[PDB]
Structure formats: C-alpha cells, structure tokens
Design a binder for these strands. Sequence first.
RNA 1: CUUUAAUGUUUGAUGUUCUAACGUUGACCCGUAAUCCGGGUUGCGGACAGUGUCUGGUGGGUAGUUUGACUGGGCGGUCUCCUCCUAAAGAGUAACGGAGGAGCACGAAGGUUGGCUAAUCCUGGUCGGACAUCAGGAGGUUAGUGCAAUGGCAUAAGCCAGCUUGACUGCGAGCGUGACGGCGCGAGCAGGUGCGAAAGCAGGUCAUAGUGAUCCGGUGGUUCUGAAUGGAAGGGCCAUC
RNA 2: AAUCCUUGUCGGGUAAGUUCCGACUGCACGAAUGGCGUAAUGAUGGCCAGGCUGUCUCCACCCGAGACUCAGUGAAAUUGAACUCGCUGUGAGAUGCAGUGUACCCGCGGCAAGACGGAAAGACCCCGUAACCUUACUAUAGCUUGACACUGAACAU
RNA 3: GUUUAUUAAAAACACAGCACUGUGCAAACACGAAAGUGGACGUAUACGGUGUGACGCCUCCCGGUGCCGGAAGGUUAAUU
RNA 4: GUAACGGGGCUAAACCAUGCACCGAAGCUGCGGCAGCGACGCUUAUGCGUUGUUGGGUAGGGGAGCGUUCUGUAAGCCUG
RNA 5: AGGACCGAACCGACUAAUGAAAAAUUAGCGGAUGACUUGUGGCUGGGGGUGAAAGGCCAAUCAAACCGGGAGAUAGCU
RNA 6: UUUUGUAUAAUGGGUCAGCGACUUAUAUUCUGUAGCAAGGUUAACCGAAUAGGGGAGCCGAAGGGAAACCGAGUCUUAACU
RNA 7: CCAUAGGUUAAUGAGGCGAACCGGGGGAACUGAAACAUCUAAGUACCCCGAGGAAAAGAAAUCAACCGAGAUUCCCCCAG
Lengths: 52, 96, 64, 76
Amino acid sequence: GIREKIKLVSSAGTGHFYTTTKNKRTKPEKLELKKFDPVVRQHVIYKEAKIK
Amino acid sequence: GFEGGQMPLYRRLPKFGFTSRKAAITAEIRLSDLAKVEGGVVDLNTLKAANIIGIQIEFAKVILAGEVTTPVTVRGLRVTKGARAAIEAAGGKIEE
Amino acid sequence: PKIKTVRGAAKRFKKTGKGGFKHKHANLRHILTKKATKRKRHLRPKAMVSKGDLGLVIACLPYA
Amino acid sequence: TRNGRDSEAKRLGVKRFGGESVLAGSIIVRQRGTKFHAGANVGCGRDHTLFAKADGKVKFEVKGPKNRKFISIEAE
RNA sequence: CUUUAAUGUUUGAUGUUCUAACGUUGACCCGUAAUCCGGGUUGCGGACAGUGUCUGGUGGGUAGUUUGACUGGGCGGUCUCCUCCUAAAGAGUAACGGAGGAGCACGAAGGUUGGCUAAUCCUGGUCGGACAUCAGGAGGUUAGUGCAAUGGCAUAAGCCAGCUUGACUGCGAGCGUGACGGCGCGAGCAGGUGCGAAAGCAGGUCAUAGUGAUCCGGUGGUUCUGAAUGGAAGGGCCAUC
RNA sequence: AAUCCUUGUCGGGUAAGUUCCGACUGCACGAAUGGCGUAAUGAUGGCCAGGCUGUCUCCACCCGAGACUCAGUGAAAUUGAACUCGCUGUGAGAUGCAGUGUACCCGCGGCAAGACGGAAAGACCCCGUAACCUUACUAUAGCUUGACACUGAACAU
RNA sequence: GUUUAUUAAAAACACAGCACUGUGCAAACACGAAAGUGGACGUAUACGGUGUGACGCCUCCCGGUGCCGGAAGGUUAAUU
RNA sequence: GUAACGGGGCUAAACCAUGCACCGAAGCUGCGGCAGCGACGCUUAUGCGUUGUUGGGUAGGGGAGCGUUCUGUAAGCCUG
RNA sequence: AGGACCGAACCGACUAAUGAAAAAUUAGCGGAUGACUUGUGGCUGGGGGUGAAAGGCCAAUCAAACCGGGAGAUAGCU
RNA sequence: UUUUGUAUAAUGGGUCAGCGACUUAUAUUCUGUAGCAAGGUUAACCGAAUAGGGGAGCCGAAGGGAAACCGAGUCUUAACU
RNA sequence: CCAUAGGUUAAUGAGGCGAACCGGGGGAACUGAAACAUCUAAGUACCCCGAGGAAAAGAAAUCAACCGAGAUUCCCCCAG
C-alpha cells in the first residue's frame, strides 16, 4: 500500500471535498480535476490537498 | 444478546443520535382532549389542571386527532394545520 | 426488581410504529475512500431489524 | 501440505429459465464471461449479469453466425 | 536589523564561613533507688542529615494474571479473500484431499469518438547473427488481456490515436445472495457534466481477489442541540482519518 | 568415564565375562556450578578370591505356633436379583444369547484359572477459556533521583 | 557428623580449609508503618553474603548479561 | 472341543428349470370395545345421529385427570 | 589427648523375614565424651516460622497448618 | 444412566422404613379468563379499615426525524416520477 | 535564682458486660465480565472506636428558572 491517499478540495470555496489515492513518487505534480460540487450544484475544479 | 462468542448484534451496529432534553417537556394534544378542559379556553395551565399533559410541560401542540365539536379558544400553543382547520370548523378561536 | 435495559442496545436501536426497530448501518464510519460511493449512499439511511435477530433485540430492550 | 485453500462459492448460473415470467429488474443469469449474451429487453451488467429490462417471459435462443446463446424477453 | 559596552535594578546557581532551626546511638547534672524517657548544662555536627507531598529510575523482593483453536496430544502445518478440480450436467456440498493466486496497480491502464488486428513459421534483404528493423507469403487468435486460474472477449473486453473527468451529487422499480451483520446487479428519475454530426455511451477499469465490524477519538463542514438567559464547550448530522 | 554408535578395539581375569581391572575416533571431560591425584574413613556403588554353608542340584526328617475336630464367645470387606456347568459361535474376550455336550441333592478340607473378583468417581493420557515455582504483561514493598516543605544568616564567583 | 517422622541414609547437606565481595560502627544486613531489637556489650586478626569444600600438584576470552568507576556529549520527571 | 449346513441327519432332505399346494407376522380380513381429528346434518342443553380417517414413539410441545396435607363450606355430616 | 577404638545403658534405623501396632516385630545393624543425649520451663505463627536443605517439620493434616466467617464461592462438568 | 450402540464383562443400587430436587419475590412479555372500554387502573398514604377515599403517577388513544421541528403524515433531497 | 517538671494527700468520674439497630476509623476475596488487568463483587464480609433508646441529619453561602419553593428524616412516583 505504497500508494497513499489525498483529498481533492473544491475551488468553489465550499468545505466540500473528494478523497482519493495517488502515487506520489511517480506523480509529483498536483491532481486537478473538474468535478461536481453538490453544494453549489455545479461542476467545479478541485485541487489536491493533503488528507491530514 | 449472547451469540456464542460472536460479536452480538447491538455491539455490531452503531450508536447514533442524541437525546433531546427539550423533547421531554413538549406535548401532543388530541382534538378530543380539548373538550376535557373547563371554560372553553386552552392554556398549558388549563391542560395541566385537566391532567391532560403534565406538570413539567413547557410546550404542547394540538394535532388533528379525534375530533372537536364545541367551540374552543386555543391560547398560547402550537396547532397543526389540520387541527387548526378543524378548530375553525367547530367555531373556535386560536391565538398565540 | 425492575428489568434493567441493555444501555448499549438502547443507544443503537429505536422502536418503530409497528413494534419494529430501526438501526443505522455498519461499514459507514471510516475506511471510506476505498468504498464506492453507491455503497456508501445505500448504507446511510436507517434500517429495520431483521426477523432472525429481532428477538435478541427485544430481550435486550424490555421497556423499548 | 500446501493445499488447504479454496474460495467461497459464488452461486452463479441461470436464475430464471425458459418461459419464466419476470419483473423488470430481475436477474436472469449470473455468469463470469458472456456465456449467454443479452438479447431483446435484457441488459448486461458490469459483471456480465443478464437482467430483464422489461416485464415478460424469458426466452433462450441461439442466434448469429457464431451460434451464441441469446436471452431475450418475450413481451407480455 | 547585525554586533557589543556603559550606568540602574532584577533571579539562577556555585563553594566559604556562621550559628539559631534540626541531629547526636559524646560528656556531665537532675527527676531517680533507673544503660528507658524527659528536662538542664555542654561538646560535636549543622541548614547538611533526616522526615512528609510530588517526581524519574530500579525493583520476580512480593502480588494478580495470561500463555488460542484445528489436529485420524505435542512437534510441524494451517486460520481472511480469489480461481480450478473433488462436486454426482440448477445452487450448495467435507477432509491435515489435489493444484495455483491475493493483502494491489492505474488521473490513464478510466470516459468517449475514430481507426486497427494476433503467435509462430517460411522466402528475400547492409552491418545483423537462433533470435532486432524492412519487404512477399503461409497461418487464422494457436496471440493479447497490469497480475493467478476459470469463464469470456473481433460488434473485440486485444492494439493505436484525438478530446476529456461519469473514477459525478441525490435517488432507485426490481432482483440475486447470505442465520444475521452484510455483500452484489440494476433500468429508470432529478441536477449538473464529457465524448460524438447524431443515434447514443459514460455513476471507474473484461469479470471474479487487493480486505477489517463496533467502541474511542482526530480533521473539515453543518446553528440541529446548547442544563437560568446570551454565547461557548461538549453532543448530534454530513464528509473523512 | 556417575561414549549415542557400543557388548568400540587391544590386554587381564573365566571353560565360557553386555559387568570388573589396565590401556588406546571426548555424539556431548576439563580446571573453585573446580581439574588431576590422594593415606585414613564408609550399614556407600561395581568386580574378583579364600572360607563357609539347604542359596542351589533336590529336597528329607524332626521340634514347636497356627491350620483341622470339640465346647464358649464371635467380626469384616462385598452384595440388583439368582433355580450361579463345558464347548463352538453370536453379541467386538458369555454361568445367563444360538447350537450343542455334559450333569442326582447337600456339605467338609484344599488350590486359585474366571466371575474383565474386592479395595481407591485412574495417579498415566486428553479436556476444562486450581495451585505453587523468567529479559511474559501489569502493578508494587524496598532502594534510589530530583522539586517544594520543616530550612536560617552573611560573603564572593 | 546431618537428612525425606511413615517406601530414598546416599555420591545428597554440613564440615575444617580456600577464594571473592560487602561493611569504619548509629557498620553492613535482618525482624519491625515505628519505637526499638539482633549483629555486638563485637569494631576489619571483626561481622555479613556468595561460591568451593581436608591434604597434595594446580587452577585463554570483558563481545553478551551483571557489578564497579567515569561523566564530555545525546535523551530525560516533577517543577516553571 | 466336533466347531466353515444351527444340530440330527440327507445322494436328496443338494443344484437348475417349470408347476400346483400348504405353513408363515403385532401386515390384511373377520367380530367386539375405546379414544383423537375432520366432513356434513341435527336443532341444541352445546353435544348428538352418524360418516370418513387416524391412534409405535426418545428429546420436546400441546391437552385432560388421580391422589396427599392444609383453609373455607363445617357449631354442618360421620364416629365408642 | 581424642568430633580416637571395642562395647551395655541411651540415641538411632542399614538388611531380613513377619496388624498385637494408622510404621510395629524378631534376628542381625550404626553412634555411643560429643557437631552427643535427656528432663523441666521458655521463645519463634502461616506467604509466617524453623530448616547441617528433604519442599523437611509446624498436634496421625503441609508447594502454604487448623477453627470460624465471606459462603448456598464458582462448576459451559458428572 | 449414558450412548451410534449395552444382557453386557460400562455407571449406580445389600434390603426395608422415613426424608430427598424446577421454589419464592419483584419486574417484563405472550396465552386464557373476568371487569370496564377510548379509556383502563391507582401507589404510598388516610381510613380499625379486605369498604370508602387517595388518580401522585403508569399504559393506551400518532407517527416521522439524530434533532430543531412537522404532524396523518413525516424524513430523505435543491426536488422527488 | 524564681519557676516548672516531679511527689504526697483529698474529692468527683470512668473502667467491665450486653442481641440487633446507629455514627465514625480501616477494609478483602471468591464471583461477574462466559479468559483478564480498568470495572464488578462492595464500601459488602470482617476488624476497631464511640453512642443512644433510638442514632445520624437538620434550619439554605439549598433548589428552581425569570414562575416560584422554603431545615432534616422516611414512604410512593419521577425511572431502569
């Protein structure tokens, strides 16, 4: 289980986030995907952040 | 709740929710119970006097349950919509 | 003496109109990111107790 | 020994047979591959599970040049 | 700000001396006919020692306990999950029966649109050779599938490329499957997206392994709650560790 | 050897010695949980010889005390009930079943093959989620560290 | 010499002797919540602990675990 | 201890084939009796004509009773 | 002189065979001026004592005495 | 008695007589039965008193939600076919 | 030195026993948790001190909730 996990956070300014895994050795750069925010009820960009 | 050594059903499952201390002082009043009081006016005190709700009760609703025939003056209490309509039909008054 | 309730049972169950018992599902507390969302969604709502273990529940909970 | 292991049985196989009336949604077959293929009014799930998309009678049939088993639903 | 010197005052500790706490299992006197005890005088020691409370260490000296099951008892081996056979042509089915795998991986190795078709062999061809790359043919999946096996797969599920985030949020008729906990499949509906001219497809990946109940907490959001009242703490609910 | 292989091999002792004594690949001696010697001592272990013998070849006789009989007194363990034989089978080792054989009823003295005889809810073995006896876990008396208290005064660095 | 009173008297224990180690006296240590008592009315030619065990000839490794000594650095309680 | 037909014994009283008799169980039938559960129909004292059928039973479930002591009924009734 | 020798009392208990005896008998056996034996009284108390050490002994009881109490401990066993 | 299974040579009983083991209390549920019935019922206590009083309370007549809250609906969800 | 300690008299009281109940000082383990250590058993058993016919407690630096109650003790509810 070397592939550690992260949380994609909404750029909408809501608290909402998704959580997922990634391989931080092979992929240093941050993951940015356009996902659905259900609080805003729109598709927003989500940026990786540390799960903590 | 002993199932051999298998972990029993209650312990399997979550705890959830919390107890409301406000719930223990609320009350639910039938339309039928509006006749039980005297004077045709319905305050929390009157109901308590009429042993309908109880002494430690700060709040009480009137629900559309049973039926009310006599006109009643409902005072200082919550009423559902259907209960309110029923009261109006009977010829009653409602006031906060 | 009075029967003592099983307090944990009390915490975990609530009786319903027809003498049933609702309860929250397991498996929706932690390790979650690996769980598919659908499964999570379905777990969320409260669930009735099954016929098989109903009796145990009752025994735990005499005053309901 | 090195051999004690085995997996839990998955209870695959045809669930409803030829000329079974089914409700839409009901599963007709559990299978690993597409041993049976989806015909009319029968959907194929992500685990190749064939299921009725409409209420009717199950209808097994061989079709096509490859001579493949096809489950369809006869209208009802 | 880097760096020090001056005047004024302020804790921390370090030994030297003291004598008044404290010690005396030194001496003498008295209670006293008394090697106890106390009082007195005195010497020595002396703020140490030693006692209390808190505190780190050590502590089988002593105490309370634990030290799995299967098993043709111990030793050895095994314990969850996936594939095949045993399994008697629905399902299921045992053995310390026979054979192998898993405790993940992938922001593409997912979605969608467009395109393509394998192994191996033969003949010819610079270095080049059994085995690179290039031609002509035979072959017809004998190949490939991220990894075991099975079942699948050309309408490819196999191989390339373009654009992308449906690896969506709320739900869900109806089924399958379990003693239960649970697990699984799912058309359709709402919202909002991507590919496509469109019909459509997309709620991860050909499928079946890649996993851990509850409690206790942790983080973020949420006025749901808030023990006189307003707040807060704590609790609940949603997401997550 | 207070050494598996092993009755090691060689020698002595015996007609014949897995023991004993003397010598020569330490499974796995070894130096104060002492090594190797050692006069004396030992109800100490092992081996050999002289003497002695009923230990034995191989038992015989005799003397007493019981056993036996008479009179008096008078227990005990055990006990489902018994009209309580052999054999071969059966049923997992038969007085009691089948087939068959044998056998008039009842004492007394003797023996001990069986009644899975009596005696003790097996001591071995296993099981079950007791007791005593280390670098298991958790504690702890004790020992020890510092901090504050009882506990003060100067002086210097 | 002693020993399992009642299945073991021995090669077991003890022994004189040897060695190590502690202990400066209010000794170490031991019994005692303590007071106190033993040690001992003794004082290192003494007392305690451990091992070995008349007499004779004798008797490499400090890495491990203990103990002893050291305290430069690291880490480290209460407290603040 | 015969001891590998249960024995006697058997040349069929063995084996094969065909046939007709009989024996043979707590099976079936016959006669008598009891009880359970259903049907219908009486016309009732809540059961009766009947009419089918059932009635082996451990764990265990359900149903209905006997008897004992004591309290009432009972200063009653029986009893030198 | 002697934890010297032989050997009665006295103390023990190596071999042997055999209820009067809940450990004895007879025949033999060891020590027998000593680390001996014995009378009377005293002291040590139960996780405690004492132990020339065997887990021995502590009232016919000992890897934790006996009496009473918690106590009808608990017994998935018979 | 225990067992898959006992004439068993597996357990127990020498015999008789006497005694010897599913109770009681309080809670809770279900069944029957009786009472009253959208109501039912009192507890301590008072009352020399099994009466009567005593309705403090409890159960029921409404549920849904974690909860605020709403209420024959409610929760879910922005909203539900 | 005065004093004090001490000493001799005199008066008053106590001492010891006793069933349970009561207040205080100490305080287990078995057991349950299907093991076991927090926890339970339980402030129980037990030991000790003291008292009375009763004891203890007792006259709000108490509750309550913006209304109010009005010392302690005991019983029924609240409520498993």
